[PDB]
Amino acid sequence: SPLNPGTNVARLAEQAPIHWVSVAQIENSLAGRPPMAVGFDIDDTVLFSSPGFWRGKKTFSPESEDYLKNPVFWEKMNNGWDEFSIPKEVARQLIDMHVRRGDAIFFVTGRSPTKTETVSKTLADNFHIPATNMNPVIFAGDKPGQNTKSQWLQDKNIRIFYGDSDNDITAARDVGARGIRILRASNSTYKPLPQAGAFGEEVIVNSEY
Amino acid sequence: SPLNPGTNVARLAEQAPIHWVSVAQIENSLAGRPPMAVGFDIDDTVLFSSPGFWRGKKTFSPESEDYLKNPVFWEKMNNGWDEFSIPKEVARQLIDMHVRRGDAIFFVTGRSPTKTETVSKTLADNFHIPATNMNPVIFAGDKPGQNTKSQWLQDKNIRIFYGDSDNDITAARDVGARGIRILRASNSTYKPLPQAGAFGEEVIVNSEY
Amino acid sequence: SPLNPGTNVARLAEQAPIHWVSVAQIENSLAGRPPMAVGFDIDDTVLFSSPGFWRGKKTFSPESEDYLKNPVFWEKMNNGWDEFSIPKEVARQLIDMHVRRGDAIFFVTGRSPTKTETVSKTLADNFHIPATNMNPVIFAGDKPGQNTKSQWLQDKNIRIFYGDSDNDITAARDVGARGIRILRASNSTYKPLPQAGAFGEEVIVNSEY
Amino acid sequence: SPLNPGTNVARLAEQAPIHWVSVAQIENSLAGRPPMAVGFDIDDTVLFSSPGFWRGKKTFSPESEDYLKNPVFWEKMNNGWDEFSIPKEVARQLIDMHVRRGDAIFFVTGRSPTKTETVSKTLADNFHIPATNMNPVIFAGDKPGQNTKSQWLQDKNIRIFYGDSDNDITAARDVGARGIRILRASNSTYKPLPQAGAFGEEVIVNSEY
Ligand SMILES: [Au+3]
Ligand SMILES: [Au+3]
Ligand SMILES: [Au+3]
Ligand SMILES: [Au+3]
């Protein structure tokens, strides 16, 4: 790699062919639609939860990804380490507007399930979600005693699903919901970053914070 | 304005909520559609024609916009000064793909009409448009003996209209055609630059050249 | 604010007049220079420590900035909450290259001092800093029993000082050290973001992670 | 190439390590310096002259670069086709400020020399350069009866040289002048675009128009 690589104005101005949207544009698209169920992935969608995953990796598996299969890690992660997770502004704006519409708010996560969890409380508190609009976090996956994310979206009739990962968008696509992408922050520890827009889906501008 | 204004990473990463598209995405959206009529604005859409407008302003009205109402200017502009106009790559790609589809290609301009014009020839030659797909330039406007751009789009059943100006997009919208925006080059002499995306329309990436 | 604000190619290509540098360019500028003392601010320079500050604000002063004057907060912050702080890649690269040069590495922070601190250990461990190159964190400020950041830079003959805040750069300028700016992440809770480049200083590219 | 390539926020925020400067910063760097000689390359530095080169290629060598060795082309190019060349705003600002300083303004070009030329007049007129600050265009090169660009910079004691091409910057470097880069417009017909910043030189922001 050159010490002085330089640049040019074609590169400076270059845009990826992404369907960017704003929160205001999403709300406009819903004007006059009755209350409905909507859903949010948690990690890197509404919470920057890398601090707990970082601590977990360092504590339980410094030299691998084994911590993510370790029940001792998940018990810590789901019962208080989200006190260190930083709520995303894009999520504050989306949740506020869905609450204003009278929509039902679901959170659906791929985190491993635990005996108890305080994540639902962390979310309702941080985002000021009235109990009437709030629903306990859904721990979705392919383990016995679980339903997949796509199945939960169908079951709860979720019409819009927000998320940062490819599998969030394809879950929405599989059930005919509108999948809307949020950008994963570049300081997330979950790498590589996804290619937001990879399915031709809407991607929310400036949604990394 | 500060000598050293600085910047920050929210600004560096900030995106306008624009529906960007590529030529390949447009072509995909048309896959399996039968031949149809499509249309292109000329100036700053398919030709960088500022060289002739610049020369015209300097020659006929250095201190005003009067040259644009001067028949002597339009006679020069429409009968050879497009030899100095630079065809846009985005237009080469779009016209090639529409020709491949067997589509009919129309050009519709707000330039003032003249006794003769060699612009139609310049376009067919520069863009390698077979005579079978080519149509003489339509000089549209609100003068007596003219029809407006919107009327021509209806009359010719033009289904897609490409252009750089707000009035290109709103003409398409008025007749229910798909208006697709091309970016005006920042070295155009026609200023201010339009706000591409101002109607929520598709905007072609990297279309300034 | 317009629903569809649009954009134009002058805006898309616009650059702030910033002296950007890479880590490789900094290292080249130092080639053949003997070992020297260099220094780093901690928060948003080498650690994304917003998780602990976020938890602190929520715990000790949800409705104000009083937590930052609260000794109970600082005891938690400096004695373990950096387990949740995320080391920045730019800092890994800079520290690795300074260690390679045989340079002495100092960390100078405006955090309030506490009875004990485990931040120095967190830094040496996370960044793999050999004990020979490592120095205990300097808690600088204007309280009695403290020296200011500028005084410490003089005292330790620190030749390069990295940091994200205006006061990091002006501290370096005051003592004739080379102040180099790192970008604060847009998901930091410490807002507004600084104007990196505001003193005409070098700013490291892509340094938000 | 994927239909929907997507993007991510590391890419969106990524910056090349370029030393960007503004016109105001350049002027500040010269404050209190006595009048001096400065120089400008012409093509894609002060004039967007692609219209004439485009017409020339089409007229004299549609299927090659031979037009550039054709004296009939150069006679047209240098004796009136710059009426269609579009002056760059960055050049207006630089020339205005150098004229304000009382500096001597030279233009040095690699265009082939002709019996007569009207380019010097076009430049003085377009840029409002007082006769006292203006100098006839220097046609530099390696043909017999010529001196190279570097030799002219030495001969005229030119202290700052502005240009868009690598050879403009390296000419300045060879004689110890300050070479400052202007961005070539992406709709120039002279491709590929140069890597502005490739020598670690200053590059003027927004200088493509
Ligand atoms: Au996620
Ligand atoms: Au137009
Ligand atoms: Au800091
Ligand atoms: Au040039």
Answer whether B198's CB lies under 8 Å from B19's CB. no
Q: Which helix (H) or strand (E) holds C9?
A: helix C9-13
Question: Which tokens go with A163?
Answer: 């998320």
Q: Do A194 and D6 touch (CB under 8 A)?
A: yes
CATH class of the B1-209 domain in this structure:
alpha beta
C11 in D contact zone (CB under 8 Å): no
User: From CA A135, how far away is CA B72, in angstroms rounded?
Assistant: 73
Classify residue A194 as exposed, middle or buried by CB count within 10 Å of its CB (0-12, 13-18, 19+): buried
Are A115 and A78 spatial neighbours (Cβ–Cβ below 8 Å)? no
User: In sequence order, what E strands does chain D have?
Assistant: 19-21, 37-40, 47-48, 86-87, 104-109, 138-139, 158-163, 178-181, 202-204
The answer to whether the Cα torsion of C100, C103, C104, C106 is positive or negative is: negative
d(CA D71, nearest CA chain B) in Å: 19
Of A168, A157, A189, A155, give the one whose Cα is nearest residue A49. A189
Report the separation in Å between the CA atom of C12 and the middle of ligand 4, taken as the mean of its atom positions. 24
Residues 6+ apart with CB under 8 A from B31: none
User: Which numbered ligand comes closest to the C-alpha of B88?
Assistant: 2
CB contacts under 8 A, C 169-188 vs B, are 183-186
Q: Residues for chain D: how many in total?
A: 209
Chain A touched by D2 (CB under 8 Å): yes
Distance, CA of B149 to CA of B153 (rounded, Å): 6
Cα separation, C171 vs C178, in Å, equals 10
Q: Scanning every residue of chain B, which has its alpha carbon at the shortest distance from the alpha carbon of C192? A: B8
Whether the CB of B21 is below 8 Å from some CB of chain A: the reply is yes
Is residue D109 within 8 Å of D137, Cβ to Cβ? yes
Query: Minimum-distance ligand to the CA of C107?
Result: 3
Instruction: Collect residues with CB below 5 Å from ion ligand 4.
Output: D 41, 43-45, 164-165
Query: What is the token pair recorded at C24?
Result: 């490789």
Place of tokens 């994200």: C164
Residue keyed to tokens 């800079």: C94
Please say whether the beta carbons of A55 and C122 come within 8 A.
Answer: no
Q: Do D6 and A197 touch (CB under 8 A)?
A: yes
Task: Compute the 3-state secondary structure of chain B and give helix, strand, coil in percent, each to the nearest 5.
Answer: 35, 15, 45
Closest partner residue to A193 (CB to CB) among D9, D194, D198 is D9
- Residues annotated within a binding site of B: 41, 43, 109-110, 149, 164
Q: How many CB atoms lie within 10 A of CB A142?
A: 9
Q: Are C207 and C88 in contact (CB under 8 A)?
A: yes
The tokens describing A62, both together, are 């410094």
Residue C43 touches chain A, beta carbons under 8 Å: no
User: Would the CA dihedral through B82, B83, B84, B90 be positive or negative?
Assistant: positive
**C59 CB within 8 Å of a chain D CB:** no
DSSP string, B84-99: G-EE-HHHHHHHHHHH
The angstrom resolution of this structure is 1.7
Method of elucidation: X-ray
Nearest C-alpha neighbor of A74 from the set A43, A44, A45? A43
Phi and psi, residue C82, nearest 5°: -75, -5
Gap sites in chain B (C to N > 2.5 Å), preceding residue numbers: none
Cβ contact B114:B45 at 8 Å: no
Q: Based on C-alpha coordinates, what's the Rg of chain C?
A: 18
Q: Any idea where the domains of chain C sit in the sequence? A: 1-209
Distance CA A125, CA A98 (A): 16
Indicate the SS3 state at residue C107. Answer: strand
User: Chain B residues with CB inside 8 Å of A25's CB?
Assistant: 17, 200
